[PDB]
Amino acid sequence: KKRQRMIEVQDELLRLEPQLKQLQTKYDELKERKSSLRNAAYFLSNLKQLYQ
Amino acid sequence: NFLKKRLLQQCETLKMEDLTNVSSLLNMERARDKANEEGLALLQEEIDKM
Known part of the structure; x- marks a missing residue:
């Protein structure tokens, strides 16, 4: 069980690192993808909707 | 006399304080x-x- 505890913590350390990287990627992708187009494709087309 | 030949019947044919004490100690060890x-x-x- 103690060896199993070390293995699970090793998975738990790996799981923690993977979840931290995945959540960092999640926040970055959320911000970039969700807000860029809703602001760029909005404004760039709204600027086109303005100027053109 | 019969107890001495009981000796002669068992010992001839065939630890304990360590048994009892160490067994209680190891029982506490198994509780631990x-x-x-x-x-x-x-x-x-x-x-x-x-």
């Missing part, structure tokens, strides 16, 4: 080991629950 498994196994259940 059950506590160890309670702690380690449960904290493993919490770790792999995480």
Whole structure:
């Protein structure tokens, strides 16, 4: 069980690192993808909707 | 007399203070080991629950 505890913590350390990287990627992708187009494709087309 | 030939019947044919004392000590040791498994196994259940 103690060896199993070390293995699970090793998975738990790996799981923690993977979840931290995945959540960092999640926040970055959320911000970039969700807000860029809703602001760029909005404004760039709204600027086109303005100027053109 | 019959107890002495009981000796001659058992010992001829065929530890204890260490048995009793060390067995009680090791029984406390197995209680401590059950506590160890309670702690380690449960904290493993919490770790792999995480």
